Amino acid sequence: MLGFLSARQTGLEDPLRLRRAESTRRVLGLELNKDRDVERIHGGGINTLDIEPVEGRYMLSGGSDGVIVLYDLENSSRQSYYTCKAVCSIGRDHPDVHRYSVETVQWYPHDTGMFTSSSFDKTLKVWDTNTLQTADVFNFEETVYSHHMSPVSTKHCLVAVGTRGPKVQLCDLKSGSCSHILQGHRQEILAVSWSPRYDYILATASADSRVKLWDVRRASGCLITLDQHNGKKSQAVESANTAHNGKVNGLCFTSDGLHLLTVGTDNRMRLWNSSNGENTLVNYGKVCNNSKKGLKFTVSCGCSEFVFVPYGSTIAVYTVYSGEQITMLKGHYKTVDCCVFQSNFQELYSGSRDCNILAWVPS
Amino acid sequence: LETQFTCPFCNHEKSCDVKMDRARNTGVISCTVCLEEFQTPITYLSEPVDVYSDWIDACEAANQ
Amino acid sequence: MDQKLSKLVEELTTSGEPRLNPEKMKELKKICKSSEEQLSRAYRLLIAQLTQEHAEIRLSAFQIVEELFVRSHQFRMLVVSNFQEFLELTLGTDPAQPLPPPREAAQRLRQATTRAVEGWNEKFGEAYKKLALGYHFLRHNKKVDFQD
Amino acid sequence: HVNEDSQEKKILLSPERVHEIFKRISDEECFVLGMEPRYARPEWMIVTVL
Ligand SMILES: [Zn+2]
Structure with a gap:
């Protein structure tokens, strides 16, 4: 590492090199x-966490008991x-x-003055963080499994909501319009995620073992349906072109938004080219x-x-583009329900059914 | 009578199953969806209705 | 020097005695103080015993574990490394995996491990926050009656 | 004792599924079941035309 500092001082290596190499080394450690602890207030398991995208200081946590706790992650003490x-x-x-x-609880992107929370009580509530009062409520005919606001949209402010209904709801923050829906799934929509790269691209994963990418501006249904085999087992699209051999219950675009990581109940994670949905066959x-x-x-x-x-009661850390298993945070x-990554300091916060939020820090 | 009850935690209808371990005088009610579990003492006159009852009572008492 | 250690541990655990016979326990103390890798060898012996199907043997292994815990510090780090499995094998928290017979020895194991965990929370809780997590999980999630 | 770790514990069996199941039955398995395919096929017991 003194080599890294020397190369940075002498200009041999761009400071980008030291920064990303040290970030990787911190994540590996x-x-x-x-010396860190998180206050315990949830009476039930923590189902979701969200650190605010700007300044990365405050963390939301939704528990199975319905309460929402807002934590300060900064060490304002001197110890x-x-x-x-x-x-x-x-x-x-x-x-x-x-x-x-x-x-699901999510900070409003572009500003920490508002957040949102969806519950199995069939409501997506929009909260003012300052007054801590519900600014808006969006009721649904069926329980909400997930929701997501676009981390990129300076233009639209749509919340994509996946309920047990087969329709993906799009609730517009502007002119409160929850009527917009996307058709094409057949069972509960267990995960939804906006592309961090493209403003109007939304990936939705449902219990019908299918993952669909939609251009929500478009009037012609989903753009791409992810297929495990990319065409080896090709059939007229009524039941084929499945992303997994089970329920696809998790989505995550990579940092650049050029790939999509889908985890399904067939005990498999898959990496997909986000532009044409081709499976990259990463194991x-x-x-x-x-x-x-x-x-x-x-x-x-x-x-x-x-x-x-x-991964059960652990966190499995994998390399996205090689698939090599780094480690188990144990x-x-x-069973662990959620993990949220603090990118500023390569930290991790995991919430599980044991009513604990555990912080993992580089050693 | 009803043996499957709505869960007080996740409000899923008929998602709670009740197990009467009479040999140990304990009734265990578990929700299949949210995996919430509760254990209460039972007698030979007890029924899944009284286990479901003790669970609701424990919830309301703990939520005070 | 592993043969005599496996032996001595075997006579200590397989005997099923209500209380640890003192002088051979002192031999275990000395020879476990001898080396660190061999202390951890005794730890593997204890772990392998604790999985085996008899409540008295599980009790002897746990009481040895408690001796080393209150007596050794690297033992505390090593056991908190897998305190989750330690609680699964001692407290029988998991419904799928029940404690093996007899019932009297199992009850004594439950009482002794509850009180030992209380003592460990009081004495080494701050130095091992994972022990604090385990104690908290036992006291609320599993609702273990520490007053019993 | 579901074949996989989780497929479905309990499902409502619609007549449409039963129709396909019966239509797949072979003309020999029907005779073994005592239903002569010439005069009665199992799928015909599902009302599609009233
Ligand atoms: Zn429930």
């Missing part, structure tokens, strides 16, 4: 945090040991608390998941790319 204190809380005494489990081995709802997993950013997938006592 991920371990149970020696080397600190607990990520809870700033705010939609608790059981809040007038607008979710009646059932919160399954990843066997990725154990049996979750009946959406599975939240994230990818690394700003490194020389990693994907952190909940500190949870029950």
Whole structure:
């Protein structure tokens, strides 16, 4: 590493080299945090986490008990040991608390003054973070499994919602219009994710073992349907062209948005060319998941790319483009529901059914 | 009578199954969807209705 | 020097005694203090015993583990490395994997491991936050009655 | 004892599925079942034309 510093000082290597190499080295040295703790407030398992995209300081967490906790991750104390204190809380005494489990919570991109939370109580609530009051509510005829706002859209502010209905709802923040729907799936839509690269590209994964990419501006259904075999087993499109041999319960675009990682209940993760949906045939081995709802997993950013997938009661870290298994982060006592990656310091926060949020820091 | 009840946590109808371990005098009610589990003592006169009852009571008491 | 250690551990555990026979336990203490890799060899012996199907043997292995825990620090790091499996094998938290017979020895194992975990939370909890996580998980998620 | 780790515990069997299942039955398996295919096929027991 002194070689890295010397090369940076002498201009031999771009500082990009040291930055990304050290980010990768930090991610590889991920371990149970020696001096860090997260305050425990959820009475039930944490189903979702979200660190705000700008300044990466505050973290939302939705629990199976319906409460939403807002933590400050910064060590505002002077000690080397600190607990990520809870700033705010939609608790059981809040007038607008979710009646059932919160399954997805997401900070509004471009601004930390608002966030959103969807629950199995058939509601997507939009909260003002300052007053901590519901600015808007979007009711659905069937329970919400996931939702996502575009991390890129300066123009549109649509929330793509996947419920147990076979339709992907698009709730417009502007002129409150939840009527827009996308047809083409056949069972519950367990995951939805906007492309970080393209403004109007949305990937949706449903229990019909299919993943569809939509240009929501378009009037002609999905753009691409992901196919495991790319055409080896080709059939008229009524039941073929499946992404997995089970329910596809997790989506994650890579950092650049040029590839898509789909995890399904066939104990398989697959990497897809996001421009034509071709399977890249990256192996990843066997990725154990049996979750009946959406599975939240994230990818690394700003490194020389990693994907952190909940794997039983562990976090499996894989190399996205080679599939090589890095490691198992092993500190949870029950199945891990979500993991969210802090890209500023290569940190990880994992929420599981054991009512714990565990922080993994580079050693 | 009904043996499958709606879960107080996830509100999924008939998603809760009740197991009466009479040999240990314990009833275990588990939701298939959200995997919430609750254990209560039972008697020979007890039924899945009274296990489902003890669960609702424990929830309301713990939520005070 | 592994033969005598496997032997001594075997007579300690297979005997099924209610209480640890003192002088051979002292021999175990000395010869475990001798080397660190051989202390961890004793740890593997304990782990292999703890999976085996008898509550008394499980009790003897756990009491040896408690001796080394209160007596050794690298043992504390090594056991907190897989405290999850340690709790699965001691407390029988998992419904699918039940504790093996007899019932009296299993009950004594439950009481002893609950109280030992209480002592470990009081004494080494701050130095090992994963022990704190395990204690908290036992006290709320599994609702283990520590007052029993 | 589902074949896979999770396929489906309980499903509602629609008449349409039964129709396909019966239509797949062979003319010999029908005779073994005591249904002469000439006069009665199992799929004919599903009302498609009233
Ligand atoms: Zn439930």
